[model samples]
Target: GSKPYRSYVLLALTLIYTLNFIDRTVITVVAQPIINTFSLSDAQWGLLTGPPFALFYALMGIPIAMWADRGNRVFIISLCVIIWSIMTVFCGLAASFIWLLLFRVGVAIGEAGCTPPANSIITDYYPPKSRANAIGIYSMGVTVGGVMAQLFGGALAGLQGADFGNFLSSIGLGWLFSGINWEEVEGWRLVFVIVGAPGILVALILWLTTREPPRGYSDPKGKTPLEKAGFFEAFREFGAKPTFWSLSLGAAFVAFVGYGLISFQAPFLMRVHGVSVSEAAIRYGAPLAAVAAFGTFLGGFLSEKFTPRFPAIVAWLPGVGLLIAIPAYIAAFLTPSLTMAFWMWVIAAIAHYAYLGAQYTVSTAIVSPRSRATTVSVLLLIVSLIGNGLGPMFTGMMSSAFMGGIIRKNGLEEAFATFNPGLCAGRMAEIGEMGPALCSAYAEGLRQSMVATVVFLVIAAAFYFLASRTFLKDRWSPA
Candidate 1:
């Protein structure tokens, strides 16, 4: 491929990846509203965001990757995009938590098709020398997606149903929806419909325009490229590679912290900083996500630049960044000053997300091109199960448990029963002194839980270091 076409393809794949995150993380932007709508405890909210979504995502990942390994990658990605986008639109129509949960499962199942094939596609476009940088660019989708999710999700989630109707009316399209009732609509619900609808168009563009590069088309020109591997064959290729396991474990733990924190980020800001949903998502969430995107690119650039000098740079570089992120994240969560918190979090996000590219760079490097997608699916399976599957659940359960303990410690058991903390966002004056106490416990419990969770990054970084130790010996192909 020419340089221009290669860059265009990479950007297109990245855009698809960005869409994946936008749909996935947009829910986090409207966390409080969902909690209020469902009358859910933090633990229940965690379950909503975690296990069910992860289970389907994990289960579908390998099969989709196996298909991608043999079938058309572009078609697989586009088809899944349309599927998830349509499901995202349906999330707005959900009448109950069960329906919403099922729709999220639909989103998960669609998203499961993204990274595995996307990573494999990149390897086909860029050679080993330049692959990590390209993958790094591709990895930026995660943070960039978060940025869009925060901006669009946060902004849309703050609007009233009538606001959208009025806009449509102003634009001369309101009569087209004459059957609709505007007053009953919530901003969060509208958010899903608006944000989700674009991907269908994106899917159309991807399916129509992007050419599927032949398998192993861009691999180093040496011996013949291996034929595409089947599920068991792909697994067997990486099954004995210690580096793959270490890389997978490291990525999993990082995801554990990443998914957990993102799930509660907006809620934490709303509770601790007293910001409105729009303010939290736009002011803090979007900017932090943008910074994290830059961090992802920087990680890839550094790995690309330093690989010659430090052969295992891709594996160990993320470890260095993860260690730096721990303190910054803790400070961001606890600081009394909102400005200080945002700046601290900016530092944390950049350092924390440096691993985004490494996960793909290392995974693909350790296997033959035939097995890249399948191998990545396995990596994602581990990540989805341990990270997405349990991260939010753990955070939510811990937050709830800590809140209960705080209530018990303060002897506010009776006050808590009188006024639910989940409903305490704007009713402090009506509930009197007990309201402030409950809200404080609610906010502080989450603060403590997040602080406890960030420490796990140490373990994530450690595994990256371990992966670095065995990288060369286990590496079967150029990364």
Candidate 2:
């Protein structure tokens, strides 16, 4: 039982998982530029970041998983990699808000094919005893992807116009690539292109090198050919498992908070602490992501060590972690000092990531082998729809509301008239004294927007506790 093939597949799958996260989180790292260019509210940003993408991701994932269960998974994955990589490149070229949204959806559609099938394949590749560890290693891709996106994204975003121009000059092919100035393009858009386009090559490599293993071949108990579970059947089956439902919903809630924080963390620093993007990336973004990765691995390791003694710890650990995160996150949001905020964020990141390994472990474990992929996809659907869809949206909407109040209190309308167009512009010229009020309004608006994002984490923590209860009852073997 040479397992070289299995190992190779797992490694490739891990890389794919990393790519998945990079594509997903790149927006979080580049939030400032997108907001500036679009004049967007948090709600609009949420829609772009979550629902459009998650909805398509959830919708397409089912068919992709179903096809993988029946067809060649390697080919399916390779095809999707190509589709998403192209879309990622297209994201960099988008000129309008709507165009970027459409491209994001396209990326989601291509990405929908990734995880479900990969999970199914992995279940067949490793034995039950080793499954948790294998999955944990696989799960590292999520954190790794997040970390790389931040690391690279922050550096790219920090580059000045002159720096970008010089880099282009050094590249020998600068002439052909000249029209779009890297300096003019927002750093976030570059994050999409620089971090995302390489996946196409990875897809080609997977297509060429990976071989699909026979389904259920690795099950030591013997190949149990489960009646092929379709999407509806799988959904029904998952519903019947209270643990699955609780875990999925709980994970969704956690995601909502996670998305909200990542969405605004950098902006929060910029607004509250007066740190620039580059400074935040180096001092804040990269460090938080690194701590989070460690937290994720630690969760996996601890869960595996303790599962035999107290299987329930897997669920409870996340609940406790979220509880700890609630205060740390709040402190991070409210603290006046950059140093204090950074430490609070680090603490929150560690606590926040402690749940990552358990989420996938619990969700996939509850379902029969045949339905693992679909079950996981459905779990992701809840997360995507709730977390990605609402988190940023809520933050944006709240930020805008706060901004409105702050503006009025500061006489922002009169202040803004100095630069305002239309009736305000005309009126402003007639009343030169109102210029200060209008400018104050604009400044007040930005301040209120950042402060309003702290409330979602409190709500997110509540859901994790509810999930803990359901996980306690889901200890039965997968039927």
Candidate 3:
């Protein structure tokens, strides 16, 4: 059974997790402005969302996880929280693309310390019979984080620099923030500073108010208690499980689609659906993320209930769900009406997100208790590299590739921008019919590129099905 303090721990971690996502994902919220300001190609925008951040995030996660195991876990988490929040504020202070990129690496190093320790702490709070639901609370942060990031980041990014500065002045805090030329610290920069500040308070709150339970002390009476196992020992054992590799890659592909789509979803709505950035953020992004979060929990709950009968529920459930999501997403992308598209989005998001919580569940399912943590760590490293590192980059390159093909085939400029909103009145007047027609073709390119990428869900589903074939045979038996 569960207790109030367990719920407290869940609430605390979930908030931290939500903030984690806001700091990390808010870059997407203002991606268009950043692209324009930097005079970046789509490929460059993709690099911002991908390589530098994801690579360091993956590389540093190991040492951080190792530190979390031996060091004071609460101190580790609190210190990370502060460091990332400071780094996030510094992101707003960046002078150029390279500066922004380096600041992002700092954020990555700090954030890499979060999840493993949080997960370990949560286990210390809840026992076997009650842990799953608590874990659900913690995991829901990702989606809720997405929702908040879009709504808040969008609102801030929608404001002009001068307007936000004046608002600060009107509130009587102008003296403190006067270091920046408010006129120069426009929407994107303001958004970063606004979103990054509150995390400091949250860190302090967690530090003073929360108590760290002794590791594994909450385990039910019969559960075995073991000392922390060696990293190599755990790695070698899980590396032998084919089920682990299959599920890791399966999860990677799903994240590949998820991350790529979210990175561009706002840009897509603005360009193709004729919505403003704020509208895309609130009207579509928030609700979609919420639905996806709920679906993640539902998939895991159902998987658990069906496990005894299905034997391979972890592997096949998400696999089947992934196959179903493709059509829904493609329909969402191709539809002319934004309203109708949102309906399709709901279906696609739910079906696609069913894979997420399952990824962690499945990764550890085949490993023995001693190897479970290490397997999950490795699984996340792979998922981060492939999903975060390559997904947006792949989509951006493809979008540019397709967009350029259409534009050139129509004899448009080689320097034609990707994901730029409507053609200017002056440009439309100058080129007459050329501007609007070219705009339509550009939007069409992105639509088709997204369509092409959604089909990869089939590949993801196939992987899960293959994992299912080996799953039952690979699972550890309780002795």
Candidate 4:
């Protein structure tokens, strides 16, 4: 591929990954609304977003990555985009909790196809000299997607369904919406439908425009290109590399805290800071995400720049960044001032997300190109099982526990038995004098939960540093 063509393909893959995040994380952006609509406990919200989605994602990941290894990655990604996009729209149409859960499962299965192949494709497009930065750009989709998710989800979830209907009418699609009663529809549902529809077109563009690069096309000149490995073969190749397991654990813990924070960030903002959902997502969520995207790029840039003097920089750099992020995140979670908290979040996000690109760059580098996708899928399996699998569920359950403790400490357990945290958001006054105390407990509960979650990043950093110690020995430099 020519340089220009490579850049275009990278951009295309990044865009697709961005769409993946938007659909995946938008539910969290409107976390409170969904919780309210369902009249759910925070634990139930955790279950909705966490375990089930991770289970199916892990179930499908390896097989799909093996398929991508042997088949056409572009086609695989395109097909997946369409599946998730349609499923996301279905999320909007869900009439019951069970239906919404099913739709989310669909979303998880489709999204599972994204990163493994995308990483393999990017590795084919860029050699090791530039691969770190290339993967970094691709990884930016996570944060960039978050930005879009926050902006679109936040803005749309705040609007009445009539707003969407009116917009459709203004766009000359009035006849299409004329039969529907928009007033009865919830804003959060519209957020899913509106945000999820465009990926189908993106799938078409990627499939039609991009050519599949040959396997190992960009590896160093002298090496013979190995055949794509089976799942066990790929695992066998890197399984002996302790760095792989260490970094996988590092990446998993990063995601544990990362997903936990994201799943609850909006709810935390709304509860403790007294902000609206839209304000939380737009003003705080989107901007911090954009900063984090820059951090992803920064990590790669620093890795490339320092690689000459520090061979294991990619593995170790993020450990240092994660350490820096801890206090910042703790401050953000506990701060009294919303403005001060936002700045703290901005600082923390940059340091925290710097690890994103490293996960792919290091994991793939430890294996031959033949096993790249499978190896990545393996990494994601660990991440999905431990990180996505339990992060939110842990936070939610902890928040509920913490809230109960707070209620008891305030001597309001009797009152709390009748109080519902889900309905506490806007209806605080109905509970009378006890309402303010219960609501305070509710808000403080989430704050304490988040603060506890940030401590997990310390363990993540430790694993990353451990990976660094073994990286050079584990590295597969064809030379």
Query: Per-prediction TM-score, please?
Result: 0.81, 0.79, 0.86, 0.82
Structure candidate 1, residue pairs in collision? none
What is the C-alpha lDDT profile of model 3 across 156-262, one tens digit per residue?
77788888778888988878566777677657888888788888888998898778777766534563435445466678777787887888888888888887887
Error of 1 at 302 (Å): 3.0
lDDT of 3: 0.77
Sort the candidates on lDDT, descending order.
4, 1, 3, 2
Question: CA lDDT of 364 in candidate 4?
Answer: 60
Off by over 4 Å in 1: 1-17, 55-57, 66-79, 114-140, 168-181, 201-237, 307-321, 355-377, 418-423, 468-479
**Which is the leading candidate under TM-score?**
3
Worst lDDT run of 10 residues, candidate 4, spans 223-232
Question: TM-score ranking from best to worst?
Answer: 3, 4, 1, 2
Model 2 lDDT, residue 403, Cα: 58
Question: What would the per-residue lDDT of candidate 2 be over residues 1-479, giving only the tens digit for each residue?
Answer: 13787788899999998888788777776666676566665557666776776546557866776777788787888899898888888887788889989888888888888877887778877878778888989987877887777777778776565565567678875783566665566656666776767888999999998777677755455545465445567667667867776676667766776776677777666655657766777678878888977876676667666654554363434566666676777776667777887888888777776775566665655666666877886677788788877777776676666656765676555554344312221244553666545534433444454445444544555555555566656665623
Model 1 lDDT, residue 243, Cα: 88
Local accuracy of candidate 1 as per-residue lDDT tens digits, 93-148:
79998999999988888888888788888888787889989987877687678788
Single out the weakest 10-residue window by summed lDDT for candidate 2: 417-426
**lDDT of candidates 1 onward, in order:** 0.82, 0.69, 0.77, 0.83
* Cα lDDT tens digits for candidate 4, 66-181: 78878888899999999999999999988888899999998988988998799888888787789999987887787778788888888887789888888888989979586889
lDDT pick, better of 1 and 3: 1
